[PDB]
């Protein structure tokens, strides 16, 4: 087919071709292609790419969108726990997911690493912060009605506003195991009481960035999975450190370009996703030079 073509693009490390090439293929087409390639060459397509092109945010976005979604969420979690835990990356993978998605993950993990996902969290992730409770509860509780809207709206405007130290497990559970419809209400109630949006109240209350972000992600998910994905991309765009912002931006693009392709509709809250991609990602560092376009391509914003 055109399998030989890409196969030559990857050896030549012609990052520019790879983008256009990848622009043609669709979700299912891609999976097909990936296995076809491995038969016609004897090379597992992803690892072959992760070994052919530079290394960094560009390689990241390509080695992510070019793969099976859950498979990726697995490699993201795998890498996120190495040294210190990349709460931003773990959060992304398990907060912006449907019950079925986390399920397929627990499964894909158990068979890629051998161990059960929920256990590794207990081992590697001590339960200290809102950040760590988010990682856990996201895989233990399921959204279910409490029928105490006004009651819960107080639970937040107290733990995020009045209380000295916010009961983290308390607040993470309220958001995680909350029904999307009850949450529309809870949230609306909170704005009335406090006069400020939960997002603000979170970011204002949690100095640690990973914790304010993780909480804000969970919160925006209960209001629209693409909104959670928008907030995340925005948090990546406004990050001053290039290695971090490109890292974050690559992952989020790589894990959600298809799943929540209309995230740019919600990004309007902060500006124009397409404009902000064109503006923010101007780096000249080799491994970052093409990310801008790989990113635009996977969001059909080009
Ligand atoms: Ca490489």
Q: Residue 107's domain is classified under what CATH number? A: 1.10.220.10
The alpha carbon dihedral of 201, 204, 208, 214 has a sign of positive
> Environment class of residue 260 by beta-carbon count within 10 Å: exposed (0-12), middle (13-18) or buried (19+)?
buried
Q: How many CB atoms lie within 10 A of CB 215?
A: 29
Domain identity same for 291 and 203: no
Q: Specify the resolution in Å.
A: 2.9
Q: How many CB atoms lie within 10 A of CB 114?
A: 7
Nearest alpha-carbon partner for 246 in 285, 218, 273, 212: 285
Separation of CA 92 and ligand 1 centre (Å): 23
Domain identity same for 30 and 53: yes
Q: What are phi and psi of 26, to 5 degrees?
A: -105, 170
Separation of CA 26 and ligand 1 centre (Å): 23
> Environment class of residue 75 by beta-carbon count within 10 Å: exposed (0-12), middle (13-18) or buried (19+)?
middle
Domain identity same for 120 and 134: no
The count of domains in the chain is: 4
Q: What are phi and psi of 80, to 5 degrees?
A: -60, -20
Separation of CA 190 and ligand 1 centre (Å): 47
Query: What six digits make up the tokens of 53?
Result: 């092109």
Separation of CA 229 and ligand 1 centre (Å): 27
Domain identity same for 147 and 182: yes
- Secondary structure of residue 301 in the 3-state scheme: coil
Separation of CA 56 and ligand 1 centre (Å): 8
**Last residue within a domain, chosen from 19, 43, 67:** 67
Q: How far is CA 130 from CA 150, 163, 220, in A?
A: 23, 15, 16
Technique used to solve these coordinates: X-ray
**Last residue within a domain, chosen from 223, 253, 275:** 223
Query: How far is 250 from 291, CA to CA, in rounded Å?
Result: 8
Contact criterion met (CB below 8 Å) for 27 and 48: no
Separation of CA 211 and ligand 1 centre (Å): 31
Q: Is 271 left (phi over 0), alpha (psi -120 to 50) or beta?
A: left
Query: What six digits make up the tokens of 300?
Result: 């059909």
Q: What are phi and psi of 138, to 5 degrees?
A: -60, -20
Domain identity same for 218 and 252: no
Separation of CA 66 and ligand 1 centre (Å): 14
**Domain, as residue range, for 96:** 68-125
Domain identity same for 48 and 1: yes
Domain identity same for 142 and 188: yes
Domain identity same for 170 and 207: yes
Domain identity same for 159 and 212: yes
Residue whose tokens read 């560009």:
58
Alpha helices in the chain (DSSP H): 3-11, 15-24, 27-41, 45-49, 57-65, 69-80, 87-95, 99-110, 117-124, 130-137, 149-159, 168-176, 180-194, 198-205, 209-221, 225-237, 242-256, 263-266, 273-280, 291-298
Domain identity same for 1 and 58: yes
Query: How far is 58 from 77, CA to CA, in rounded Å?
Result: 19
Separation of CA 208 and ligand 1 centre (Å): 32
Q: What are phi and psi of 115, to 5 degrees?
A: -80, 165
Q: Is 206 left (phi over 0), alpha (psi -120 to 50) or beta?
A: beta
- Secondary structure of residue 13 in the 3-state scheme: coil
Separation of CA 57 and ligand 1 centre (Å): 11
Query: How far is 129 from 284, CA to CA, in rounded Å?
Result: 37
Separation of CA 247 and ligand 1 centre (Å): 15
Q: How many CB atoms lie within 10 A of CB 172?
A: 26
**Last residue within a domain, chosen from 17, 47, 67:** 67
Query: How far is 176 from 155, CA to CA, in rounded Å?
Result: 14
Q: Do the annotations mark residue 125 as ligand-binding?
A: no
Query: What six digits make up the tokens of 252?
Result: 């989020």
Q: Do the annotations mark residue 53 as ligand-binding?
A: yes
């Amino acid at each position: 087919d055109a399998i030989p073509e890409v196969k030559a693009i990857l050896e030549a490390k012609n990052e520019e071709e790879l983008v256009t090439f990848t622009s043609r293929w669709s979700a299912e087409e891609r999976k097909e292609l990936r296995t076809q390639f491995q038969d016609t060459t004897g090379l597992e397509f992803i690892a072959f790419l992760k070994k052919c092109i530079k290394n960094g945010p560009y390689e990241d976005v390509m080695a992510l969108g070019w793969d099976c979604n859950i498979s990726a969420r697995v490699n993201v979690i795998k890498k996120a726990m190495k040294n210190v835990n990349d709460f931003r990356a773990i959060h992304d993978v398990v907060l912006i997911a449907t019950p079925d998605e986390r399920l397929k993950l627990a499964q894909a993990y158990k068979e890629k690493t051998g161990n059960d996902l929920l256990q590794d969290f207990v081992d590697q992730i001590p339960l200290t912060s809102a950040a760590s409770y988010l990682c856990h509860l996201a895989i233990r509780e399921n959204r279910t009605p409490r029928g105490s809207v006004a009651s819960d709206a107080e639970v937040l405007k107290h733990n995020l506003i009045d209380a000295d130290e916010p009961d983290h497990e308390a607040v993470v559970r309220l958001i995680i195991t909350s029904t999307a419809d009850e949450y529309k209400e809870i949230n609306h109630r909170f704005e009335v009481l406090t006069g400020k949006s939960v997002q603000e109240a979170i970011e204002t209350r949690y100095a640690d960035k990973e914790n304010a972000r993780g909480l804000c992600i969970a919160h925006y998910y209960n209001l629209a999975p693409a909104r959670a994905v928008a907030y995340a991309f925005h948090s990546a765009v406004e990050t001053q450190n290039d290695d971090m912002a490109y890292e974050q931006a690559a992952r989020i693009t790589g894990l959600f370009h298809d799943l929540h392709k209309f995230a740019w509709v919600h990004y309007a809250c902060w500006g124009v996703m397409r404009d902000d991609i064109l503006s923010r990602f101007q780096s000249k560092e080799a491994n970052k030079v093409n990310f801008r376009d790989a990113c635009l391509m996977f969001w059909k914003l080009a």
